[PDB]
Amino acid sequence: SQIIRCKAAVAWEAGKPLVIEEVEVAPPQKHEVRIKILFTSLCHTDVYFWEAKGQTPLFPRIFGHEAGGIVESVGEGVTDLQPGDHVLPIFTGECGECRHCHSEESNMCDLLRINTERGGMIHDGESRFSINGKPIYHFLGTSTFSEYTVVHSGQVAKINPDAPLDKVCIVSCGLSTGLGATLNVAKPKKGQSVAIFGLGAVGLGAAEGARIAGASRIIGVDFNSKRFDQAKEFGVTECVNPKDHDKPIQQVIAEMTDGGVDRSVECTGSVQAMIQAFECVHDGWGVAVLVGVPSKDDAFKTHPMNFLNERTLKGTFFGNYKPKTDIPGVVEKYMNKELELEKFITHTVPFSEINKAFDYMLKGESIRCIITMGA
Amino acid sequence: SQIIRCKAAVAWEAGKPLVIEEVEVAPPQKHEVRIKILFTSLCHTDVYFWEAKGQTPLFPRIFGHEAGGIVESVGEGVTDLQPGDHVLPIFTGECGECRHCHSEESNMCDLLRINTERGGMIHDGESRFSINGKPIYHFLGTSTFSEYTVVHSGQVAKINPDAPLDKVCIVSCGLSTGLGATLNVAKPKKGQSVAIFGLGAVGLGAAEGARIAGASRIIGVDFNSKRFDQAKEFGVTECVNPKDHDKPIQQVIAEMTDGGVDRSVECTGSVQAMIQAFECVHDGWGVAVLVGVPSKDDAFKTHPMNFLNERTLKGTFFGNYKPKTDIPGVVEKYMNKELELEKFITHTVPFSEINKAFDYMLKGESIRCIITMGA
Ligand SMILES: [Zn+2]
Ligand SMILES: [Zn+2]
Ligand SMILES: [Zn+2]
Ligand SMILES: [Zn+2]
Numbered sequence: 001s002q003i004i005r006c007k008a009a010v011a012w013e014a015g016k017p018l019v020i021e022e023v024e025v026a027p028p029q030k031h032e033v034r035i036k037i038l039f040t041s042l043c044h045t046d047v048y049f050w051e052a053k054g055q056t057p058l059f060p061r062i063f064g065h066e067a068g069g070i071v072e073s074v075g076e077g078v079t080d081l082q083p084g085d086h087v088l089p090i091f092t093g094e095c096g097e098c099r100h101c102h103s104e105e106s107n108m109c110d111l112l113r114i115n116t117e118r119g120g121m122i123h124d125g126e127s128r129f130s131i132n133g134k135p136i137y138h139f140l141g142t143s144t145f146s147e148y149t150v151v152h153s154g155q156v157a158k159i160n161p162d163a164p165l166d167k168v169c170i171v172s173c174g175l176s177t178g179l180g181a182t183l184n185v186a187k188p189k190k191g192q193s194v195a196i197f198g199l200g201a202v203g204l205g206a207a208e209g210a211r212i213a214g215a216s217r218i219i220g221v222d223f224n225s226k227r228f229d230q231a232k233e234f235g236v237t238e239c240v241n242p243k244d245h246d247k248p249i250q251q252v253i254a255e256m257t258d259g260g261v262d263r264s265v266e267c268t269g270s271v272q273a274m275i276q277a278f279e280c281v282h283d284g285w286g287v288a289v290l291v292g293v294p295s296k297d298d299a300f301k302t303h304p305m306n307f308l309n310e311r312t313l314k315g316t317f318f319g320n321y322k323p324k325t326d327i328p329g330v331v332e333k334y335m336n337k338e339l340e341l342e343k344f345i346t347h348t349v350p351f352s353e354i355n356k357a358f359d360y361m362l363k364g365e366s367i368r369c370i371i372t373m374g375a
Numbered sequence: 376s377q378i379i380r381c382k383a384a385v386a387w388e389a390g391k392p393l394v395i396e397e398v399e400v401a402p403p404q405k406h407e408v409r410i411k412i413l414f415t416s417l418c419h420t421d422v423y424f425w426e427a428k429g430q431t432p433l434f435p436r437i438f439g440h441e442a443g444g445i446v447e448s449v450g451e452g453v454t455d456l457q458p459g460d461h462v463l464p465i466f467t468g469e470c471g472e473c474r475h476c477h478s479e480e481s482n483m484c485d486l487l488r489i490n491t492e493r494g495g496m497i498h499d500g501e502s503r504f505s506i507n508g509k510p511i512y513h514f515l516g517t518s519t520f521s522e523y524t525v526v527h528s529g530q531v532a533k534i535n536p537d538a539p540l541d542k543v544c545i546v547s548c549g550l551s552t553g554l555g556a557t558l559n560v561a562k563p564k565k566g567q568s569v570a571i572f573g574l575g576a577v578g579l580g581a582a583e584g585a586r587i588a589g590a591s592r593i594i595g596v597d598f599n600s601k602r603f604d605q606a607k608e609f610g611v612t613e614c615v616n617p618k619d620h621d622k623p624i625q626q627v628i629a630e631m632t633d634g635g636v637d638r639s640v641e642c643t644g645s646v647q648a649m650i651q652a653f654e655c656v657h658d659g660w661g662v663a664v665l666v667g668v669p670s671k672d673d674a675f676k677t678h679p680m681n682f683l684n685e686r687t688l689k690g691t692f693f694g695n696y697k698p699k700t701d702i703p704g705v706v707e708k709y710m711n712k713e714l715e716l717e718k719f720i721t722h723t724v725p726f727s728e729i730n731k732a733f734d735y736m737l738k739g740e741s742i743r744c745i746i747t748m749g750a
Contacts, residue, residue: 106659106685274679284481290682300682301674304649307665307690310481315682 001027001034001073008129008146009354010136012060014052017355018145023062023136025148026128028075032121033153035087039166040067040144040371042357043173044200045091049116049139050358054295058119061137062129064144065091066173066368068165071156078153080324086161088172088331090323091140093154107322112154114140114317122152145354147373157327160335167341168331170201170368173318175344176330178205178267180319181291183213186263190214193257196236197277198267198292199227201344201367204234205319206265206291211235212338219261221249221273224364233343250280257282264288271298278302283309290315344368350375376402376409376448383504383521384729385511387435389427392730393520398437398511400523401503403450407496408528410462414541415442415519415746417732418548419575420466424491424514425733429670433494436512437504439519440466441548441743443540446531453528455699461536463547463706465698466515468529482697487529489515489692497527520729522748532702535710542716543706545576545743548693550719551705553580553642555694556666558588561638565589568632571611572652573642573667574602576719576742579609580694581640581666586610587713594636596624596648599739608718625655632657639663646673653677658684665690719743725750 004025009018028034046063049055071085081087093112100106100113111122119137120126128150129136129143143149159168178201186209188194194210196203199222210218211234220231220239228239240256242249254260259282266277269292278288279302288311307313321327333339347369349356360366379400384393403409421438424430446460456462468487475481475488486497494512495501503525504511504518518524534543553576561584563569569585571578574597585593586609595606595614603614615631617624629635634657641652644667653663654677663686682688696702708714722744724731735741 100659103660108659108685271679274682284475284483285478290679293683294679297678299676300679301676303672304646304665304669304675304690307649307675307688308668308692309690310483310692310695311690313682313688315679315684315686317683317685320685 003027004148006147007351008062008136009351010060010062010131011050014057014059015050020352021131023146024130025146025150028073028150029121029123030076031078031153032075032123032150033078033081033156034072034148034150035069035089035156036072036148037067037069037144037146037373039169039373040064041170041368042066042361042371044361046139047358047361048295056117058117058137061119061139062143062145063139065089065140065142066169067142067144068169072148074153081153081156081158085158086163086165088157088159088169088327089142089144089149089151090155090157090172090327091142092318092323093152094322094324095154096324107318107320109154112152116140121150155323157324159328159331163331163335166370166372167345168334169370170341170344171327171330171334174201174368175205175341176321176327177291177319178202178265179209179330180321181265181267181289181316182206182209184320185314185316186265186287186289188213188215188263191216192262193217193219195219195221195253195261195264195277195280196267197221197265197273199231200267202267202291204231204344204367206267207231207234207236208339219253219256226364248276250276253280259283260286262286266290267292269294271296271300274300275302278311278313279306281311283311285310287312287314291319345370348372378402379523381522382726383437383511384726385435385437385506386425389432389434390425395727396506398521399505400521400525403448403525404496404498405451406453406528407450407498407525408453408456408531409447409523409525410444410464410531411447411523412442412444412519412521412748414544414748415439416545416743417441417736417746419736421514422733422736423670431492433492433512436494436514437518437520438514440464440515440517441544442517442519443544447523449528456528456531456533460533461538461540463532463534463544463702464517464519464524464526465530465532465547465702466517467693467698468527469697469699470529471699482693482695484529487527491515496525530698532699534703534706538706538710541745541747542720543709544745545716545719546702546705546709549576549743550580550716551696551702552666552694553577553640554584554705555696556640556642556664556691557581557584559695560689560691561640561662561664563588563590563638566591567637568592568594570594570596570628570636570639570652570655571642572596572640572648574606575642577642577666579606579719579742581642582606582609582611583714594628594631601739623651625651628655634658635661637661641665642667644669646671646675649675650677653686653688654681656686658686660685662687662689666694720745723747
């Protein structure tokens with residue numbers, strides 16, 4: 001295996017438009033695979049680090065972690081993947097042999113769990129991307145905004161080769177995070193009520209999960225009212241904008257539902273929203289689930305009696321899905337027509353116009369925009 | 376049915392010794408039962424309201440809610456109890472026909488749930504106790520520090536008539552609160568580790584529950600080191616006094632257990648302890664359970680990532696036991712030799728020396744002191 005010269009969308013500077021560059025992609029080392037990306041999409045997380053909003057900024061960098069592609073080659077020690085396999089790169093991995101992977105409960109692999117600071121590969125700490133002999137840094141070990149990328153095999157989910165990669169690429173992050181938050185963690189029973197804070201891809205995945213679970217009432221909470229109408233296609237039965245009410249939103253929800261919803265799922269990462277999501281569930285049997293990741297360090301706060309009145313608060317990561325074990329199953333759920341993905345896709349652009357996907361997201365116009373390589 | 380003249384231990388004034396008085400006990404009204412108390416014990420909750428520490432103080436008052444006795448008569452509409460039945464009064468009830476009672480998850484009856492302010496009966500708002508025509512107020516609808524008391528039937532658990540009332544009287548509050556907090560809510564699997572904050576009756580019930588569940592490691596946390604040795608009889612494998620460590624106790628526990636315990640149970644009601652109990656459980660699969668009731672209004676606070684790292688926080692009330700449905704079953708657990716109650720009993724006094732039970736508790740010398748009527 002040798003070096004590949006291809007196109008990648010490089011971020012040279014925070015908040016500036018990506019530039020299509022010719023980059024060089026080194027061959028995969030031990031336990032790595034090199035993937036030809038066919039379709040990729042944009043997630044709020046790409047945007048957050050591209051703006052360098054909070055974290056330690058790292059540039060130049062190739063973003064992107066939602067994608068579908070085909071294995072071009074594998075490094076030594078790789079046995080579960082071969083050239084030609086259809087795959088989804090995942091931003092967090094499953095080594096399959098650590099304490100967390102062995103557990104039935106957790107998907108937080110000690111080897112391969114999400115790391116937003118890391119710009120190089122595990123094996124040697126180096127980037128496989130370069131331009132004129134200078135490193136272009138990785139993002140989440142996936143960097144899918146490139147015609148070719150290199151990814152640790154534990155972060156590569158082999159899927160059904162008949163599944164259309166331009167649809168199921170969105171399964172690798174946002175949608176599955178919400179879907180699993182509901183189906184694996186909240187676990188609403190048939191007939192129950194659910195409140196969902198946030199109506200982006202995670203929230204709409206959570207709603208979709210509640211619909212699949214047979215929830216009879218699904219209340220969407222978002223500050224942008226223009227997200228409301230489309231939300232009904234995902235099973236949301238009514239939407240509430242906290243701005244239209246003087247009362248705290250948890251009180252509004254509790255009055256709507258004679259004491260509160262049976263389940264809630266907080267998908268925005270706002271701490272105030274976490275607090276509201278917890279307090280809006282019913283006493284006795286209410287269960288709140290946090291999945292949105294916060295940008296601030298503000299503490300979760302609440303009066304202890306809210307708990308002693310028999311509420312439960314659960315946090316989850318990536319919907320408690322195991323990347324390699326479970327995600328292929330999620331693709332099947334779509335193949336077998338339980339899961340409806342098409343409605344998540346509101347836009348499509350060629351790789352050459354990738355910056356448009358940023359525009360659509362920053363304007364709140366899109367759910368997911370599919371970016372198509374080779375055009 | 377007519378009026379009974381008997382002895383009761385009356386509190387006339389906050390923090391002052393109880394006085395044995397001759398009181399009059401009116402006959403039971405609709406859905407009420409009148410009980411001859413044979414054995415009763417003291418709980419920290421009696422003491423807290425007797426000192427009038429926080430709540431709205433109400434005097435004169437007859438305290439006591441842990442007891443075993445025999446039904447003397449029943450009011451109209453009572454069908455599940457008859458004179459001669461062996462019973463345990465419970466501080467919180469089960470009407471059996473409200474939304475909370477119908478639920479599989481909750482024991483927070485809409486009709487009969489704990490009320491610490493109420494000095495009279497539900498039916499008419501009046502007390503059945505009097506001295507010289509003046510009311511002596513009820514406590515938790517049980518008031519068991521009297522040779523005879525009147526209690527709503529929903530708060531009266533008929534139990535096995537062969538069970539010794541001078542042992543199983545402690546089953547009606549503290550012990551069962553802890554036992555159930557562990558067995559019904561924490562639900563530790565065989566081999567797991569458990570941290571228990573507080574080594575009073577609730578904590579020792581929680582420990583006993585963890586032992587019964589087959590926990591391999593049970594770590595007791597209490598500020599009073601003299602509670603440690605006796606705790607081993609309850610299954611505690613080691614004890615830790617936060618005062619002997621510079622590090623925060625949740626860090627100490629996490630270092631003892633390679634990341635934290637599998638389960639924790641907070642039994643003191645200290646808010647700081649609730650925070651520590653939550654943070655000391657392991658990421659991925661850790662579950663913390665709050666059951667101790669706070670005396671202050673301080674908020675529970677913690678960094679949200681502690682949740683998103685896949686921790687779970689559960690609050691419970693009375694160990695999630697249904698008073699009438701489950702508590703008789705707990706007595707059987709003792710009859711069938713699964714549950715060991717004798718070790719909870721460290722003292723015994725006659726009703727005439729009831730104030731001694733207060734002394735033993737205030738000196739931290741006792742777990743439970745049995746008070747015996749008729750002497
Ligand atoms: Zn692993
Ligand atoms: Zn994402
Ligand atoms: Zn009820
Ligand atoms: Zn008590």
